[PDB]
Amino acid sequence: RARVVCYFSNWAVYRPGVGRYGIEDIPVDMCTHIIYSFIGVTEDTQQVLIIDPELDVDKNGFKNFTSLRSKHPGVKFTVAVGGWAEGGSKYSKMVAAKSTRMAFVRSVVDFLNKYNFDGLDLDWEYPGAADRGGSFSDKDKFLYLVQELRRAFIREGKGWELTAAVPLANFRLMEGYHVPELCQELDAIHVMSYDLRGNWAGFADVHSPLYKRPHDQWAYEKLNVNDGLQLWEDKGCPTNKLVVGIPFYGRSFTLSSGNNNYNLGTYINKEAGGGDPAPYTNATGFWAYYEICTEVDTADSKWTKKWDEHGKCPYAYKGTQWVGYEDPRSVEIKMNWIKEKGYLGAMTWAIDMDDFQGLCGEKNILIKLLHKHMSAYTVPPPR
Ligand SMILES: *[C@@H]1O[C@H](CO)[C@@H](O)[C@H](O)[C@H]1NC(C)=O
Ligand SMILES: *[C@@H]1O[C@H](CO)[C@@H](O)[C@H](O)[C@H]1NC(C)=O
Protein backbone atom coordinates (compact mmCIF):
# COMPACT_ATOMS: atom_id res chain seq x y z
CA ARG A 1 0.00 0.00 0.00
CA ALA A 2 3.20 2.02 -0.36
CA ARG A 3 3.56 4.55 -3.14
CA VAL A 4 6.19 4.85 -5.85
CA VAL A 5 5.68 8.38 -7.18
CA CYS A 6 7.28 9.14 -10.52
CA TYR A 7 7.62 12.68 -11.82
CA PHE A 8 7.73 12.80 -15.64
CA SER A 9 9.25 15.94 -17.31
CA ASN A 10 7.47 16.97 -20.53
CA TRP A 11 10.62 18.69 -21.79
CA ALA A 12 12.83 15.58 -21.72
CA VAL A 13 11.57 14.70 -25.21
CA TYR A 14 13.81 17.48 -26.56
CA ARG A 15 17.05 16.03 -25.23
CA PRO A 16 19.29 14.93 -28.06
CA GLY A 17 20.19 11.41 -29.08
CA VAL A 18 19.88 8.77 -26.40
CA GLY A 19 18.67 11.41 -23.93
CA ARG A 20 15.28 11.73 -25.71
CA TYR A 21 12.59 10.53 -23.34
CA GLY A 22 8.88 10.64 -24.14
CA ILE A 23 5.60 9.25 -22.83
CA GLU A 24 6.30 5.97 -24.45
CA ASP A 25 9.50 5.58 -22.41
CA ILE A 26 7.78 5.66 -19.02
CA PRO A 27 8.06 2.25 -17.29
CA VAL A 28 4.52 2.53 -16.04
CA ASP A 29 4.35 -0.65 -14.00
CA MET A 30 7.30 0.43 -11.86
CA CYS A 31 5.26 3.37 -10.45
CA THR A 32 2.01 3.65 -8.53
CA HIS A 33 1.47 7.39 -9.23
CA ILE A 34 2.94 9.23 -12.22
CA ILE A 35 2.88 13.03 -12.44
CA TYR A 36 3.08 14.99 -15.71
CA SER A 37 5.28 18.04 -15.07
CA PHE A 38 4.52 20.98 -15.50
CA ILE A 39 1.56 23.21 -16.18
CA GLY A 40 1.62 26.78 -14.86
CA VAL A 41 -0.62 29.69 -13.94
CA THR A 42 -1.24 32.74 -16.10
CA GLU A 43 -0.03 36.07 -14.74
CA ASP A 44 -3.11 38.08 -15.66
CA THR A 45 -6.13 35.82 -15.38
CA GLN A 46 -5.06 33.15 -12.86
CA GLN A 47 -5.96 30.34 -15.25
CA VAL A 48 -4.08 27.14 -15.98
CA LEU A 49 -1.16 27.92 -18.32
CA ILE A 50 -0.25 25.15 -20.77
CA ILE A 51 3.49 25.63 -21.05
CA ASP A 52 4.21 23.61 -24.29
CA PRO A 53 0.91 23.51 -26.09
CA GLU A 54 2.38 22.08 -29.29
CA LEU A 55 3.50 19.02 -27.35
CA ASP A 56 0.95 18.84 -24.54
CA VAL A 57 -2.14 19.51 -26.64
CA ASP A 58 -1.42 19.48 -30.42
CA LYS A 59 0.63 16.23 -30.23
CA ASN A 60 -1.65 14.93 -27.51
CA GLY A 61 0.98 14.73 -24.80
CA PHE A 62 -1.45 15.06 -21.84
CA LYS A 63 -3.93 12.56 -23.29
CA ASN A 64 -1.34 10.03 -24.35
CA PHE A 65 -0.08 10.15 -20.80
CA THR A 66 -3.47 9.74 -19.13
CA SER A 67 -4.58 7.09 -21.62
CA LEU A 68 -1.74 4.98 -20.31
CA ARG A 69 -4.37 3.89 -17.70
CA SER A 70 -6.07 1.77 -20.38
CA LYS A 71 -3.31 -0.80 -20.20
CA HIS A 72 -2.24 0.06 -16.66
CA PRO A 73 -5.43 0.60 -14.71
CA GLY A 74 -4.12 0.45 -11.15
CA VAL A 75 -1.80 3.46 -11.67
CA LYS A 76 -2.88 7.11 -11.07
CA PHE A 77 -1.90 9.77 -13.59
CA THR A 78 -1.93 13.33 -12.31
CA VAL A 79 -0.48 16.72 -13.37
CA ALA A 80 1.88 19.04 -11.45
CA VAL A 81 1.46 22.85 -11.47
CA GLY A 82 4.43 25.09 -10.73
CA GLY A 83 8.05 23.87 -10.68
CA TRP A 84 11.21 25.96 -10.56
CA ALA A 85 11.06 27.56 -14.03
CA GLU A 86 7.56 28.88 -13.37
CA GLY A 87 8.79 31.09 -10.53
CA GLY A 88 6.83 31.88 -7.39
CA SER A 89 5.51 35.39 -7.99
CA LYS A 90 2.52 34.32 -10.13
CA TYR A 91 1.42 31.94 -7.40
CA SER A 92 1.70 34.50 -4.59
CA LYS A 93 -0.37 36.78 -6.82
CA MET A 94 -2.94 34.11 -7.53
CA VAL A 95 -3.53 33.21 -3.87
CA ALA A 96 -3.70 36.83 -2.67
CA ALA A 97 -7.52 37.01 -2.85
CA LYS A 98 -10.48 34.65 -2.72
CA SER A 99 -11.63 35.78 -6.17
CA THR A 100 -8.28 34.97 -7.86
CA ARG A 101 -8.03 31.63 -6.08
CA MET A 102 -11.53 30.72 -7.20
CA ALA A 103 -10.67 31.62 -10.79
CA PHE A 104 -7.69 29.27 -10.62
CA VAL A 105 -9.68 26.48 -8.94
CA ARG A 106 -12.33 26.58 -11.63
CA SER A 107 -9.67 26.57 -14.33
CA VAL A 108 -7.96 23.53 -12.73
CA VAL A 109 -11.21 21.57 -12.51
CA ASP A 110 -11.98 22.26 -16.23
CA PHE A 111 -8.45 21.21 -17.16
CA LEU A 112 -8.44 17.96 -15.16
CA ASN A 113 -11.70 17.03 -16.78
CA LYS A 114 -10.60 18.00 -20.31
CA TYR A 115 -7.46 15.81 -20.22
CA ASN A 116 -8.71 12.97 -17.97
CA PHE A 117 -6.26 13.45 -15.14
CA ASP A 118 -6.72 11.78 -11.70
CA GLY A 119 -5.84 14.90 -9.76
CA LEU A 120 -3.29 17.66 -9.14
CA ASP A 121 0.11 17.95 -7.55
CA LEU A 122 0.99 21.46 -6.22
CA ASP A 123 4.59 22.46 -6.83
CA TRP A 124 4.70 26.17 -6.00
CA GLU A 125 8.32 26.87 -5.08
CA TYR A 126 7.65 28.34 -2.56
CA PRO A 127 4.95 30.16 -0.54
CA GLY A 128 6.52 32.76 1.72
CA ALA A 129 9.90 32.70 -0.10
CA ALA A 130 11.24 36.21 -0.52
CA ASP A 131 13.76 34.91 -3.07
CA ARG A 132 10.87 33.57 -5.15
CA GLY A 133 8.42 36.47 -5.20
CA GLY A 134 6.61 35.46 -2.02
CA SER A 135 5.59 37.25 1.13
CA PHE A 136 4.29 36.59 4.62
CA SER A 137 0.57 36.17 3.86
CA ASP A 138 1.33 33.33 1.49
CA LYS A 139 1.40 30.87 4.39
CA ASP A 140 -2.26 31.36 5.29
CA LYS A 141 -3.37 31.88 1.69
CA PHE A 142 -1.68 28.74 0.36
CA LEU A 143 -3.56 26.77 2.97
CA TYR A 144 -6.75 28.46 1.82
CA LEU A 145 -5.99 27.44 -1.79
CA VAL A 146 -5.45 23.85 -0.70
CA GLN A 147 -8.69 23.79 1.27
CA GLU A 148 -10.58 25.29 -1.66
CA LEU A 149 -9.12 22.86 -4.17
CA ARG A 150 -10.01 19.92 -2.00
CA ARG A 151 -13.57 21.16 -1.68
CA ALA A 152 -13.84 21.57 -5.43
CA PHE A 153 -12.44 18.14 -5.96
CA ILE A 154 -15.02 16.70 -3.58
CA ARG A 155 -17.77 18.49 -5.45
CA GLU A 156 -16.65 17.03 -8.71
CA GLY A 157 -17.18 13.56 -7.24
CA LYS A 158 -14.51 11.77 -9.22
CA GLY A 159 -12.22 10.98 -6.25
CA TRP A 160 -9.36 13.11 -7.53
CA GLU A 161 -6.24 13.31 -5.46
CA LEU A 162 -4.54 16.51 -4.34
CA THR A 163 -0.88 16.27 -3.39
CA ALA A 164 2.02 18.70 -2.95
CA ALA A 165 5.78 18.74 -3.38
CA VAL A 166 7.40 20.41 -0.36
CA PRO A 167 10.85 21.47 0.87
CA LEU A 168 12.49 20.27 4.03
CA ALA A 169 14.41 23.21 5.39
CA ASN A 170 12.90 24.55 8.58
CA PHE A 171 12.97 28.16 7.41
CA ARG A 172 10.95 27.23 4.34
CA LEU A 173 8.51 25.32 6.55
CA MET A 174 8.05 28.28 8.90
CA GLU A 175 7.58 30.71 6.02
CA GLY A 176 5.24 28.74 3.82
CA TYR A 177 3.60 25.63 5.30
CA HIS A 178 0.87 25.14 7.94
CA VAL A 179 1.93 21.52 8.30
CA PRO A 180 -0.91 19.82 10.20
CA GLU A 181 -3.66 21.56 8.24
CA LEU A 182 -1.96 20.87 4.92
CA CYS A 183 -1.22 17.20 5.72
CA GLN A 184 -4.89 16.78 6.58
CA GLU A 185 -6.11 18.08 3.20
CA LEU A 186 -3.58 16.33 0.97
CA ASP A 187 -3.40 12.64 -0.07
CA ALA A 188 0.40 12.63 0.00
CA ILE A 189 3.25 14.99 0.76
CA HIS A 190 6.12 14.53 -1.75
CA VAL A 191 9.17 15.65 0.15
CA MET A 192 11.93 17.19 -2.01
CA SER A 193 14.70 15.55 -0.02
CA TYR A 194 17.34 16.67 -2.53
CA ASP A 195 19.03 19.89 -3.61
CA LEU A 196 20.03 20.09 0.07
CA ARG A 197 23.51 21.29 -1.06
CA GLY A 198 24.68 22.75 -4.38
CA ASN A 199 26.68 25.53 -6.00
CA TRP A 200 24.55 28.18 -4.27
CA ALA A 201 26.00 27.05 -0.91
CA GLY A 202 29.57 27.82 -1.90
CA PHE A 203 31.16 24.46 -1.17
CA ALA A 204 31.13 20.95 -2.75
CA ASP A 205 28.92 18.38 -1.05
CA VAL A 206 26.41 15.61 -1.84
CA HIS A 207 22.89 16.95 -2.20
CA SER A 208 20.78 14.23 -0.62
CA PRO A 209 22.71 13.16 2.50
CA LEU A 210 20.69 10.76 4.66
CA TYR A 211 22.27 11.66 7.98
CA LYS A 212 24.28 14.54 9.47
CA ARG A 213 28.02 14.81 8.78
CA PRO A 214 30.48 16.46 11.13
CA HIS A 215 30.90 19.49 8.79
CA ASP A 216 27.17 20.26 8.93
CA GLN A 217 26.68 23.41 11.05
CA TRP A 218 24.08 26.15 11.67
CA ALA A 219 21.28 26.01 9.07
CA TYR A 220 22.86 22.86 7.58
CA GLU A 221 22.96 21.00 10.90
CA LYS A 222 19.56 19.30 10.35
CA LEU A 223 19.40 19.73 6.56
CA ASN A 224 19.62 16.01 5.71
CA VAL A 225 16.96 13.51 4.74
CA ASN A 226 16.55 11.77 8.12
CA ASP A 227 16.30 14.97 10.16
CA GLY A 228 14.18 16.73 7.54
CA LEU A 229 11.56 13.98 7.49
CA GLN A 230 11.68 13.95 11.30
CA LEU A 231 10.97 17.74 11.17
CA TRP A 232 7.85 17.09 9.07
CA GLU A 233 6.70 14.53 11.65
CA ASP A 234 7.51 16.93 14.56
CA LYS A 235 5.46 19.69 12.94
CA GLY A 236 2.47 17.37 12.74
CA CYS A 237 2.44 15.41 9.50
CA PRO A 238 1.47 11.71 9.91
CA THR A 239 4.12 9.21 8.87
CA ASN A 240 1.72 7.60 6.45
CA LYS A 241 1.31 10.79 4.40
CA LEU A 242 5.09 11.39 3.87
CA VAL A 243 6.70 10.21 0.59
CA VAL A 244 10.48 10.53 0.45
CA GLY A 245 12.03 12.02 -2.69
CA ILE A 246 15.09 10.35 -4.27
CA PRO A 247 17.00 12.32 -6.93
CA PHE A 248 17.92 10.55 -10.18
CA TYR A 249 20.50 13.33 -10.81
CA GLY A 250 23.63 14.87 -9.31
CA ARG A 251 24.58 18.41 -8.27
CA SER A 252 27.98 19.25 -9.65
CA PHE A 253 30.64 21.88 -8.98
CA THR A 254 33.73 23.38 -10.55
CA LEU A 255 36.45 23.36 -7.90
CA SER A 256 38.42 26.51 -7.16
CA SER A 257 41.64 27.12 -9.10
CA GLY A 258 44.52 24.95 -7.88
CA ASN A 259 42.33 23.13 -5.35
CA ASN A 260 43.50 19.55 -4.84
CA ASN A 261 41.30 18.74 -1.88
CA TYR A 262 38.31 16.73 -3.06
CA ASN A 263 36.74 16.10 0.33
CA LEU A 264 33.18 17.01 1.27
CA GLY A 265 33.03 20.74 2.03
CA THR A 266 35.91 21.71 -0.25
CA TYR A 267 35.91 25.25 -1.74
CA ILE A 268 34.53 25.83 -5.19
CA ASN A 269 34.62 28.32 -7.97
CA LYS A 270 31.17 29.61 -7.26
CA GLU A 271 31.08 31.99 -10.22
CA ALA A 272 31.35 29.03 -12.57
CA GLY A 273 27.71 28.32 -11.56
CA GLY A 274 28.38 24.62 -11.01
CA GLY A 275 30.02 21.82 -12.92
CA ASP A 276 30.19 22.09 -16.70
CA PRO A 277 26.95 21.05 -18.56
CA ALA A 278 26.58 17.46 -19.57
CA PRO A 279 25.62 16.52 -23.16
CA TYR A 280 21.97 15.59 -22.75
CA THR A 281 20.64 17.84 -19.97
CA ASN A 282 22.88 20.80 -20.92
CA ALA A 283 22.56 22.47 -17.53
CA THR A 284 25.38 23.90 -15.45
CA GLY A 285 25.56 22.25 -12.01
CA PHE A 286 23.11 19.43 -12.87
CA TRP A 287 23.79 15.97 -14.34
CA ALA A 288 21.22 13.20 -14.99
CA TYR A 289 22.01 9.84 -13.40
CA TYR A 290 22.68 8.38 -16.89
CA GLU A 291 25.11 11.21 -17.57
CA ILE A 292 27.00 10.37 -14.39
CA CYS A 293 27.15 6.57 -14.73
CA THR A 294 28.28 6.74 -18.35
CA GLU A 295 31.29 8.78 -17.25
CA VAL A 296 32.11 7.36 -13.79
CA ASP A 297 31.38 3.66 -14.13
CA THR A 298 33.07 2.75 -17.43
CA ALA A 299 36.02 0.38 -17.18
CA ASP A 300 38.61 2.97 -18.21
CA SER A 301 37.06 5.89 -16.42
CA LYS A 302 39.48 8.52 -15.11
CA TRP A 303 36.92 9.66 -12.53
CA THR A 304 37.57 8.85 -8.89
CA LYS A 305 34.52 7.68 -6.95
CA LYS A 306 34.18 8.04 -3.19
CA TRP A 307 31.58 7.45 -0.53
CA ASP A 308 30.14 9.78 2.13
CA GLU A 309 30.08 7.40 5.11
CA HIS A 310 27.64 9.51 7.10
CA GLY A 311 25.43 10.89 4.32
CA LYS A 312 25.41 7.50 2.60
CA CYS A 313 25.82 9.00 -0.91
CA PRO A 314 28.42 8.64 -3.65
CA TYR A 315 30.46 11.44 -5.08
CA ALA A 316 32.98 11.47 -7.92
CA TYR A 317 35.54 13.87 -9.32
CA LYS A 318 38.00 14.41 -12.15
CA GLY A 319 40.10 17.52 -12.74
CA THR A 320 38.16 20.54 -11.60
CA GLN A 321 34.80 18.71 -11.76
CA TRP A 322 33.02 17.22 -8.77
CA VAL A 323 29.53 15.67 -8.53
CA GLY A 324 27.45 14.29 -5.65
CA TYR A 325 24.50 12.00 -6.49
CA GLU A 326 22.59 8.74 -5.78
CA ASP A 327 23.61 5.33 -7.06
CA PRO A 328 22.18 1.87 -6.45
CA ARG A 329 23.97 1.50 -3.10
CA SER A 330 22.64 4.78 -1.73
CA VAL A 331 19.16 4.24 -3.09
CA GLU A 332 19.02 0.75 -1.49
CA ILE A 333 20.02 2.30 1.84
CA LYS A 334 17.26 4.90 1.57
CA MET A 335 14.59 2.33 0.63
CA ASN A 336 15.48 0.31 3.72
CA TRP A 337 15.35 3.44 5.83
CA ILE A 338 11.89 4.42 4.45
CA LYS A 339 10.60 1.02 5.53
CA GLU A 340 12.30 1.31 8.96
CA LYS A 341 10.59 4.69 9.54
CA GLY A 342 7.19 3.66 8.19
CA TYR A 343 6.79 6.37 5.58
CA LEU A 344 4.19 6.23 2.78
CA GLY A 345 6.72 5.52 0.05
CA ALA A 346 9.34 6.84 -2.33
CA MET A 347 9.24 9.54 -5.01
CA THR A 348 11.68 10.24 -7.86
CA TRP A 349 12.71 13.47 -9.50
CA ALA A 350 12.55 12.36 -12.29
CA ILE A 351 11.89 9.10 -14.16
CA ASP A 352 13.33 10.57 -17.41
CA MET A 353 16.81 10.66 -15.84
CA ASP A 354 17.11 6.97 -14.78
CA ASP A 355 19.34 4.92 -17.10
CA PHE A 356 16.28 4.08 -19.15
CA GLN A 357 18.38 3.08 -22.23
CA GLY A 358 20.65 0.84 -20.16
CA LEU A 359 23.73 2.79 -21.29
CA CYS A 360 25.55 1.54 -18.17
CA GLY A 361 24.24 -1.98 -18.57
CA GLU A 362 21.09 -2.17 -16.53
CA LYS A 363 17.92 -0.51 -17.88
CA ASN A 364 15.88 1.55 -15.38
CA ILE A 365 18.10 0.40 -12.53
CA LEU A 366 17.06 3.07 -9.98
CA ILE A 367 13.27 2.92 -10.45
CA LYS A 368 13.51 -0.87 -10.32
CA LEU A 369 15.02 -0.47 -6.84
CA LEU A 370 12.17 1.79 -5.72
CA HIS A 371 9.63 -0.64 -7.12
CA LYS A 372 11.28 -3.77 -5.66
CA HIS A 373 11.40 -2.34 -2.19
CA MET A 374 8.09 -0.54 -2.06
CA SER A 375 6.02 -3.25 -3.66
CA ALA A 376 6.98 -5.70 -0.88
CA TYR A 377 6.29 -3.20 1.88
CA THR A 378 3.18 -2.57 3.94
CA VAL A 379 2.88 0.96 5.35
CA PRO A 380 2.21 0.75 9.14
CA PRO A 381 -0.42 2.83 10.99
CA PRO A 382 0.65 6.39 11.92
CA ARG A 383 3.28 6.58 14.65
C1 LIG B 1 0.99 10.38 -28.73
O1 LIG B 1 0.78 9.15 -29.37
C2 LIG B 1 0.66 9.23 -30.78
C3 LIG B 1 0.29 7.88 -31.38
O2 LIG B 1 1.27 6.96 -31.04
C4 LIG B 1 2.02 9.65 -31.32
O3 LIG B 1 1.99 9.82 -32.70
C5 LIG B 1 2.39 10.98 -30.68
O4 LIG B 1 3.64 11.40 -31.09
C6 LIG B 1 2.36 10.93 -29.16
N1 LIG B 1 2.62 12.24 -28.59
C7 LIG B 1 3.41 12.42 -27.56
C8 LIG B 1 3.61 13.81 -27.11
O5 LIG B 1 3.96 11.54 -27.00
C1 LIG C 1 22.56 24.68 -23.89
O1 LIG C 1 21.81 25.63 -23.23
C2 LIG C 1 22.46 26.86 -23.42
C3 LIG C 1 21.99 27.88 -22.41
O2 LIG C 1 22.72 27.55 -21.27
C4 LIG C 1 22.12 27.31 -24.80
O3 LIG C 1 22.66 28.59 -25.01
C5 LIG C 1 22.77 26.36 -25.75
O4 LIG C 1 22.27 26.62 -27.02
C6 LIG C 1 22.34 24.95 -25.37
N1 LIG C 1 23.00 24.03 -26.22
C7 LIG C 1 22.35 23.00 -26.69
C8 LIG C 1 23.15 22.14 -27.56
O5 LIG C 1 21.23 22.72 -26.44
Author numbering: 24 to 406
From the paper:
The glycosyl hydrolase family 18 (GH18) chitinases (EC 3.2.1.14) are enzymes that hydrolyze chitin, a β-1,4-linked N-­acetylglucosamine (GlcNAc) linear polymer, into chito­oligosaccharides. Among the eight groups of insect chitinases, group I chitinases have been enzymatically well characterized and have been shown to function in a chitin-degradation process that is closely associated with insect moulting. Our previous work reported on the group I insect chitinase OfChtI (previously called OfCht5) from Ostrinia furnacalis, a species of moth that is the most destructive insect affecting corn production. OfChtI is highly active in the hydrolysis of chitooligosaccharides, colloidal chitin and α-chitin, and exhibits kinetic properties that differ from those of bacterial and plant chitinases.
Thus, the truncated form of OfChtI (OfChtI-CAD; residues 19–407) was cloned, expressed and purified for crystallization. OfChtI-CAD crystals were obtained by vapour diffusion and the structure was determined by X-ray diffraction. The crystals belonged to space group P65 and the structure was solved at a resolution of 1.7 Å. The final solved structure contained residues Arg24–Arg406 with two N-GlcNAc residues at the N-glycosylation sites Asn87 and Asn305. Like most reported chitinases, OfChtI-CAD folds into two distinct domains: a core domain and an insertion domain (CID). The chitinase signature motif ‘DxDxE’ (Asp144–Glu148) is located in the loop between strand β4 and helix α4. According to the catalytic mechanism, the glutamate residue Glu148 is the catalytic acid/base, the aspartic acid residue Asp146 is critical for stabilizing the enzyme–substrate intermediate, and Asp144 appears to be crucial for keeping Asp146 protonated. A long substrate-binding cleft was observed on the surface of OfChtI-CAD and its volume was estimated to be 1628 Å3, with a surface area of 999 Å2, using the CASTp software. The cleft is composed of a set of aligned aromatic residues that includes Trp34, Tyr37, Phe61, Trp107, Phe194, Trp223, Trp241, Tyr243 and Trp372. Surprisingly, a unique flat plane characterized by four aromatic residues, Phe159, Phe194, Trp241 and Tyr290, was observed on the surface of OfChtI-CAD.
